[PDB]
Amino acid sequence: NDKVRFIKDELRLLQEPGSYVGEVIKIVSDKKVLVKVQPEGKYIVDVAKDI
Amino acid sequence: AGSKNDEVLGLLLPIAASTDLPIETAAMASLALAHVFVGTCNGDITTSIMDNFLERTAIELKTDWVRFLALALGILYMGQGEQVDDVLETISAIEHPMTSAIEVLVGSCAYTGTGDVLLIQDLLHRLTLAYAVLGIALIALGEDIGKEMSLRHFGHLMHYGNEHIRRMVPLAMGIVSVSDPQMKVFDTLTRFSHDADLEVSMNSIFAMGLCGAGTNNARLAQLLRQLASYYSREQDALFITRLAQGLLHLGKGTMTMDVFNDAHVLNKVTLASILTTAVGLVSPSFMLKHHQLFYMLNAGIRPKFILALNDEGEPIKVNVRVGQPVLLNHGERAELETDEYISYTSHIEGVVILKKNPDYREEE
Amino acid sequence: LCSIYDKWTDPNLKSSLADVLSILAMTYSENGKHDSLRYRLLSDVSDFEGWGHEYIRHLALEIGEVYNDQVEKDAEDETSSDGSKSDGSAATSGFEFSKEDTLRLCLDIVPYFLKHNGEEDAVDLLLEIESIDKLPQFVDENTFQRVCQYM
Amino acid sequence: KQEEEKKQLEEIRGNPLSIGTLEEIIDDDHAIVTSPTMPDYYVSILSFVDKELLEPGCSVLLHHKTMSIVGVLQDDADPMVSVMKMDKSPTESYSDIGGLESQIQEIKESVELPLTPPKGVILYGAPGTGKTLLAKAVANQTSATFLRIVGSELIQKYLGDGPRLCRQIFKVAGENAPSIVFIDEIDAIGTKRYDSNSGGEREIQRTMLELLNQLDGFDDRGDVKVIMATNKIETLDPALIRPGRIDRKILFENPDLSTKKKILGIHTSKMNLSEDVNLETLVTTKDDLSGADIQAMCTEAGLLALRERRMQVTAEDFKQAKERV
């Protein structure tokens, strides 16, 4: 089972929308980090709750 | 101020015990008794208003007789160290924007300059209010960290939507305007004159004469030439422009308000008449009381002043270097002069008794 | 000659014997904390007019710093007003906050810069030294006017 | 409390929403926007904050919806203007710069003198002694709002910023008046090239010409003035010069021995020395250096006396330091 679940586990992760690497341009007090997406332009956008 | 006496206190303290602003007048009597004992610990008034404020004498319900007594002790103690402590008991007790700030502001003049960076620390929080806006004007006196950014922030403080500050600043401007004026808002006071308020106009008419009082154009440029294009759109405007254009030319348009003078020393004569004019001088604007509050500034108003003196040391022919007005004979007009000729000790700006090199020696 | 050196609180007198036996203790080969330093604590003049040996440089600045915070920061906190006019204030005044050792070691250093005439610059140092040994004995003499005006 | 009062104003928006650029603010309280991803939509603010707070062609609060304008978004990406050194009664005065007085009078008579006439000057010559130091001198001596901008700073390849950038500068020039207009190092927006087409940048001229349109749009009795600092004389419009408006070209040259000596006497004494070091000692051995190698002689002298392990520098070190730097 060690594998089994674990193996299975990745399949989940093997299903992604994605994770955008992005270029934070800055934040504001808004807690929306002002971010240029790498190919895209900037988007001031909330963060991960843990960051 | 300069004559200070217990008598009008002893007059106005039972009047203060009688506590009536519209009759006893005791409210601003405390404010006058604030302009009496300035810069000294007066044990009587310390207890007197402690026997007024805390006792909440007679009519006091209003925040009025609360505050009229507050700043009353708030002027007097100044500079005494340990002996200033009971002044907060009348001030910082009752909760207002005058409250948690003055907790250490009674030290500001008692510190005679401060050693702690605490000044900008806490005061910024309430800032980030009219006399909280004012709170930093004391910070520039003794601490180097709180002197600077006020300049282009003043009219920006004026730029804040609330008249609370928008009345505060044009009143807080005049003293600063003849010290470190806000040049653009001079035009924006014009633009905002009628903008959301015609009392802003009333002030944007009136307070232009205030800032334009004895200082004219130069640093004050964008303010005053509007008072020349201000004449009458209204008889009240025509009245307040007549306030303004009188204040514009107040002192023949040549005067200056600088609390500090070139001797490396402060003045609490003026500083006593400042915040009294803040609760007063309310005729065109909020905190309104009555007309005659205009002239309380007369304790501190200066003309631009250089007294050049020879080895007579009192008015005599003698001259500094070039003026505007000329080489200055005694009591001729100028300000802030490091000139050629020597004084008796520590040549500085300002009033200087001129002594001359014996080789070229001259009265000048 | 060790017992004439016993009572050490002097602002001046004990000086040279604490210079003499110490240079004698320095020529004794002791350049560190030794009989020499015990003299340096107790030299309130070791070499003032004269030039200091390796004696002053090492042994002063060892306790010249031990002196520093001994007197310095006693005055940042207090219940009374700031400033004192007393020459007898070493910041051992009231309760003892300061070793006269450190004091007189510095009260060599205080003369050591009494001759130096570093008045204007030494202010903020002497403020960040805050040695009420120093500035009274830092200038007891010379010109009081301009020297101490830019103080 | 106000938290939610404000937060509801946020709760309006939804999120994360899209940073996106305006194109045209329109009074419909719509406006057409600009996306780096290039959806560009004629769309409305969410109105509490103001259209006026922003400009057509500025990055603004936009939903992901139509990129509906959410409200005022900075677009803090730049300052309040293009790229500027904003100073008022600036540090440098004619005294601090050593004797430049030859052209100080040029900047004096043009700017200082009329303030009681031409609208400004052209700086040329060398920076760090003549131009930059003169730049603030009468600007300080008139004590007005000194706006320092380099053509490389402004070197805008985007069409219309270079003018808008300059306009953002002219925005300050009009409101912040009295405003000293300083313009540094134009090799790029100021070279009109040969043509309006085929690979030559209009935004060169378009920056300049509108900068010039706004330059030629003012002349004074001495209140507000302009400064042109750069080494390329003829790449620029004569209307940019416009003889009669800027007739002052201030072209600095290596400070002459006394003007040198003033920068010397200033910068010699301000690097510690041994009285062996002397002005005419340092004057004479020079080729007529700039005011900098004056300093630079003095600067390194410390380091060469630091190379001598001494803070009080010998006369040779300066002589070395100059003949080094």
The chains found to touch D (3+ Cβ pairs under 8 angstroms) are A, B
Distance CA B72, CA B32 (A): 7
The chains found to touch C (3+ Cβ pairs under 8 angstroms) are B
Question: Which of A34, A37, A46 has the most D C-beta neighbours within 10 Å, making it the best mutation to test the interface with D?
Answer: A34
Distance between C96 CA and the closest CA of chain B, angstroms: 24
Q: What share of chain B is helix, strand, coil (3-state, %, to 5)?
A: 50, 5, 45
Note whether C145 contacts B: Cβ–Cβ < 8 A: no
Note whether D118 contacts B: Cβ–Cβ < 8 A: no
- Write the DSSP assignment of D79-117 as a string of letters: -SSSS-EEEES-S--TTTT-S-HHHHHHHIIIIIGGG--
Radius of gyration in angstroms for the set of CA atoms belonging to chain A, rounded to a whole number? 16
Distance between C136 CA and the closest CA of chain B, angstroms: 23
D129 is in an annotated binding site: yes
- B332 near B317, Cβ under 8 Å? no
**Which three-class secondary structure state does DSSP give residue D227?**
strand
Note whether C3 contacts B: Cβ–Cβ < 8 A: no
Distance CA D57, CA D32 (A): 9
Distance CA C19, CA C37 (A): 10
Q: Which residue type is seen at C138? A: F
- B313 near B299, Cβ under 8 Å? no
Residues of C in contact with B82 (CB under 8 A): 79-81
Q: Which residue does chain D place closest to A46, by CA atoms?
A: D16
B226, B316, D193, D205, D209 from D196: Cα distances, Å? 45, 72, 8, 9, 12
Cis, peptide link before residue D276, omega less than 30° from 0: no
Of B355, D15, B152, nearest to B363 by C-alpha is: B355
**Which three-class secondary structure state does DSSP give residue C47?**
coil
- D87 near D227, Cβ under 8 Å? no
The chains found to touch B (3+ Cβ pairs under 8 angstroms) are C, D
Distance between C75 CA and the closest CA of chain B, angstroms: 13
At D89, list the tokens: 């009664």
Residues of B in contact with C80 (CB under 8 A): 82
- Dihedral sign (CA C123, C127, C130, C136): positive
Q: Count CB atoms within 10 A of the CB of residue B257.
A: 21
Query: Which residues are within 8 A (CB) of C98 and not within 5 positions of it... i.e. 6 or more apart?
Result: C67, C70, C71, C74, C90, C91, C92
- D200 near D193, Cβ under 8 Å? yes
Residues of D in contact with A24 (CB under 8 A): none
- Say yes or no for a CB contact (<8 Å) between B222 and D177: yes
Residues of D in contact with B183 (CB under 8 A): 176-178
Query: Which residues are within 8 A (CB) of C9 and not within 5 positions of it... i.e. 6 or more apart?
Result: C100, C104
Q: How far is CA C76 from the centre of its chain?
A: 21
Q: Which residue does chain B place closest to C78, by CA atoms?
A: B82
Distance CA B284, CA B286 (A): 7
Residues of A in contact with D20 (CB under 8 A): 41
Q: Which long-range contacts (CB under 8 A, 24 or more apart) does B82-85 make?
A: B82/C79, B82/C80, B82/C81, B83/B41, B84/B41, B84/B109, B84/B110
Query: Which residues are within 8 A (CB) of C64 and not within 5 positions of it... i.e. 6 or more apart?
Result: C105, C106, C109
Of D239, D240, D235, nearest to D181 by C-alpha is: D240
- Say yes or no for a CB contact (<8 Å) between C80 and B346: no
The chains found to touch A (3+ Cβ pairs under 8 angstroms) are D
**Which three-class secondary structure state does DSSP give residue B245?**
helix
At B30, list the tokens: 């405390």
- Say yes or no for a CB contact (<8 Å) between D178 and B187: no
**Which three-class secondary structure state does DSSP give residue C65?**
helix
- Beta partners for residue D25, in sequence order: D31
Residue D21 φ then ψ, to 5°:
-85, 145
Residues of B in contact with D176 (CB under 8 A): 183-184
- Say yes or no for a CB contact (<8 Å) between D175 and B221: no
CA dihedral D278, D280, D284, D289 (to 10 degrees): 80
Residues of B in contact with C124 (CB under 8 A): none
Of B291, B269, B287, B270, nearest to B279 by C-alpha is: B287
Tokens 């400033």 found at: C83
Going by the DSSP 8-state scheme, the letter that residue C51 receives in this structure is P
Distance between B20 CA and the closest CA of chain D, angstroms: 37
Q: What share of chain D is helix, strand, coil (3-state, %, to 5)?
A: 40, 15, 45
Distance between B247 CA and the closest CA of chain D, angstroms: 24
At D73, list the tokens: 């978004």
At D229, list the tokens: 């600092």
- B147 near B181, Cβ under 8 Å? no
Distance between D171 CA and the closest CA of chain B, angstroms: 12
Going by the DSSP 8-state scheme, the letter that residue C60 receives in this structure is I
At D161, list the tokens: 């910023």
- CA neighbours closer than 13 Å in the CB half-sphere of residue D311: 0
- B350 near B305, Cβ under 8 Å? yes
At B304, list the tokens: 């631009």
Distance between B218 CA and the closest CA of chain D, angstroms: 9
Task: Describe the crossing of helices B26-34 and B6-18 by its angle, rounded to 10 degrees.
Answer: 150
Q: How far is CA B272 from the centre of its chain?
A: 8
Residue D267 φ then ψ, to 5°:
-90, -15
B138, B259, B306, D64 from B266: Cα distances, Å? 11, 6, 18, 59
Tokens 């003892």 found at: C96
- Cβ–Cβ pairs < 8 A, chains B and C: 5
- D165 near D156, Cβ under 8 Å? yes
Of D131, D147, D157, D111, nearest to D230 by C-alpha is: D131
D130 is in an annotated binding site: yes
**Geometric angle at alpha carbon D207, from D202 and D209, rounded to 5°:** 85
D127 is in an annotated binding site: yes
Q: In what order do the strands lie in the sheet with A42-46?
A: A22-26, A32-37, A42-46
Distance between D59 CA and the closest CA of chain A, angstroms: 9
Residues of A in contact with D19 (CB under 8 A): 34, 41-44
Q: Which residue type is seen at C91? A: A
- D180 near D161, Cβ under 8 Å? no
- B179 near B215, Cβ under 8 Å? no
Exposure letters B200-219 (e unless 16+ CB within 10 A, then b): bbbbbbbbbbbbbbbbbeeb
Considering all CA atoms of chain D, what is the largest pairwise distance in Å, rounded to the nearest integer? 77
Distance CA A42, CA B181 (A): 40
Tokens 């004056």 found at: D294
According to DSSP, the β-strands at D225-229 and D18-25 are unpaired
At D184, list the tokens: 């540094």
- Say yes or no for a CB contact (<8 Å) between D176 and B221: no
C91, C93, C104 from C83: Cα distances, Å? 12, 13, 22
Residues of B in contact with D178 (CB under 8 A): 183, 221
Q: Which residue does chain A place closest to D77, by CA atoms?
A: A25
- C39 near C21, Cβ under 8 Å? yes
Q: Which residue does chain D place closest to B151, by CA atoms?
A: D88
Residues of B in contact with C81 (CB under 8 A): 81-82
Note whether B216 contacts D: Cβ–Cβ < 8 A: no
Number of residues in chain C:
151
Radius of gyration in angstroms for the set of CA atoms belonging to chain D, rounded to a whole number? 25
Q: Which residue type is seen at A45? A: V
- Say yes or no for a CB contact (<8 Å) between B81 and C81: yes
- Beta partners for residue A30, in sequence order: none
Query: Which residues are within 8 A (CB) of D160 and not within 5 positions of it... i.e. 6 or more apart?
Result: D57, D203, D206
| Contact flag for C and D (3+ C-beta pairs < 8 Å) | no
Cis, peptide link before residue D16, omega less than 30° from 0: yes
Distance CA C75, CA C81 (A): 10
Q: Which residue type is seen at D192? A: K
- Say yes or no for a CB contact (<8 Å) between D16 and A46: yes
At C119, list the tokens: 């008045």
Q: Which of D36, D76, D77 sits opposite A40 (nearest CB)?
A: D36
Q: Which residue type is seen at B14? A: P
Distance CA B279, CA D244 (A): 54
- B223 near B212, Cβ under 8 Å? yes
Residue B190 φ then ψ, to 5°:
-60, -55
Of B240, B202, B208, B239, nearest to B221 by C-alpha is: B208
Of C117, C102, C151, C125, nearest to C48 by C-alpha is: C117
Residues of D in contact with A38 (CB under 8 A): none
- Say yes or no for a CB contact (<8 Å) between B82 and C81: yes
Radius of gyration in angstroms for the set of CA atoms belonging to chain C, rounded to a whole number? 15
- Beta partners for residue B354, in sequence order: none
